[PDB]
Design an enzyme around this catalytic site. Structure first.
Site, PDB file in Angstrom:
ATOM      1  N   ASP A  15      -8.891  -5.026  -6.002  1.00 27.90           N
ATOM      2  CA  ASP A  15      -8.378  -3.957  -5.126  1.00 27.90           C
ATOM      3  C   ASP A  15      -8.955  -2.622  -5.587  1.00 27.90           C
ATOM      4  O   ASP A  15      -8.556  -2.094  -6.628  1.00 27.90           O
ATOM      5  CB  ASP A  15      -6.851  -3.975  -5.151  1.00 27.90           C
ATOM      6  CG  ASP A  15      -6.218  -3.001  -4.216  1.00 27.90           C
ATOM      7  OD1 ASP A  15      -6.918  -2.091  -3.742  1.00 27.90           O
ATOM      8  OD2 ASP A  15      -5.001  -3.143  -3.976  1.00 27.90           O
ATOM      9  N   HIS A  24      -7.404  -5.300  -1.596  1.00 26.21           N
ATOM     10  CA  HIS A  24      -6.206  -4.552  -1.144  1.00 26.21           C
ATOM     11  C   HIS A  24      -5.472  -5.273  -0.001  1.00 26.21           C
ATOM     12  O   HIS A  24      -4.308  -4.945   0.208  1.00 26.21           O
ATOM     13  CB  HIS A  24      -6.624  -3.147  -0.707  1.00 26.21           C
ATOM     14  CG  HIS A  24      -5.511  -2.219  -0.483  1.00 26.21           C
ATOM     15  ND1 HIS A  24      -4.602  -1.944  -1.465  1.00 26.21           N
ATOM     16  CD2 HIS A  24      -5.122  -1.485   0.588  1.00 26.21           C
ATOM     17  CE1 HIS A  24      -3.707  -1.080  -1.025  1.00 26.21           C
ATOM     18  NE2 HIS A  24      -4.020  -0.754   0.268  1.00 26.21           N
ATOM     19  N   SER A  67       0.879  -1.190   0.000  1.00 26.27           N
ATOM     20  CA  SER A  67       0.000   0.000   0.000  1.00 26.27           C
ATOM     21  C   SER A  67       0.906   1.226   0.000  1.00 26.27           C
ATOM     22  O   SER A  67       1.809   1.271  -0.828  1.00 26.27           O
ATOM     23  CB  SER A  67      -0.957  -0.120   1.156  1.00 26.27           C
ATOM     24  OG  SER A  67      -1.892   0.936   1.107  1.00 26.27           O
TER      25      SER A  67
END
Length: 257
Positions: free
Chosen positions: A173, A204, A127
């Site tokens: 995601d 995600h 991320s």
């Protein structure tokens, strides 16, 4: 011979295993400067040194969400430095600075400095931590590899990166979608070897749970670049299948590297 090769000749089974052939030790990071602390994982076998990878957290999160990676990768013959960021909402570039500060701590000041070959380092992150790999690679082009897992960064131009780059995306995601993040980053990289692997149906949070598809390619990338270990090229080239029922939905690379 390659002096950096570790472990027996690999197989599909050996890169998919939850634990590689090295016994693992671990301890907290104590007295860190320039990042938030974390945990170190390392082979107990001190007959040789290993490369090191720093792993940076990502979605308003802490190292614990990624901590399966500590033993998964260290047991393949790596020192793993799993870090906390200085602030849980740090932007991508600060996270890349912190990745480099943690490599510097590990190689110069940590209790396992003597276990690391300070010339063979990598950085990874999930991320926004994966978005920080641009700043880590641009500030430290001597890194052997970067590995971004569902990387997030508003800056799409990673054309100045010269470090071998692996990205993982998730087809489901909606936070750091491939179209808006990993694929634009990958497409801009013209001056490095690179690899992009997208996980079918993955959201995600795919990096936060043991994932054999992500792990086997992460391991292979670190072996190929951190250890110069061409025994692992066979898993990267041509790399995963992308058929309708495969766990990988998209795959692109610069094979044979």
């Amino acid at each position: 011979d390659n002096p950096y090769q570790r472990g027996p000749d690999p197989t599909n089974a050996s890169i998919e295993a939850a634990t590689g052939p090295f016994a693992v030790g671990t301890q907290p990071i104590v007295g860190a400067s320039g990042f938030g602390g974390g945990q170190i994982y390392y082979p107990t076998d001190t007959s040789q040194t290993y490369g090191a990878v720093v792993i940076v957290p990502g979605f308003i999160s802490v190292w614990a969400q990624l901590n399966w990676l500590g033993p998964r990768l260290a047991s393949q013959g790596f020192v793993v430095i799993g870090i906390e960021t200085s602030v849980i909402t740090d932007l991508p570039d600060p996270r890349g600075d912190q990745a480099l500060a943690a490599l510097d701590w590990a190689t110069t000041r940590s209790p396992v400095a003597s276990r690391i070959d300070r010339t063979r380092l990598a950085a990874a992150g999930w991320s926004m931590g994966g978005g920080g790999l641009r700043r880590a690679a641009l500030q430290r082009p001597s890194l052997k590899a970067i590995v971004g897992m569902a990387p997030w960064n508003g800056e799409r131009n990673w054309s100045a990166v010269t470090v071998p780059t692996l990205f993982f995306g998730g087809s489901s995601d909606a936070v750091a979608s491939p179209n808006d993040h990993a694929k634009p980053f990958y497409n801009s990289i013209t001056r490095a070897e690179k690899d992009y692997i997208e996980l079918r149906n993955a959201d995600h949070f795919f990096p936060t749970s043991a994932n054999t598809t992500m792990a086997k390619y992460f391991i292979s990338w670190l072996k190929r670049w951190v250890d110069n270990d061409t025994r692992y090229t066979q898993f990267l080239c041509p790399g995963p299948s992308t058929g309708l029922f495969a766990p990988v939905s998209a795959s692109m690379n610069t094979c044979p590297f």
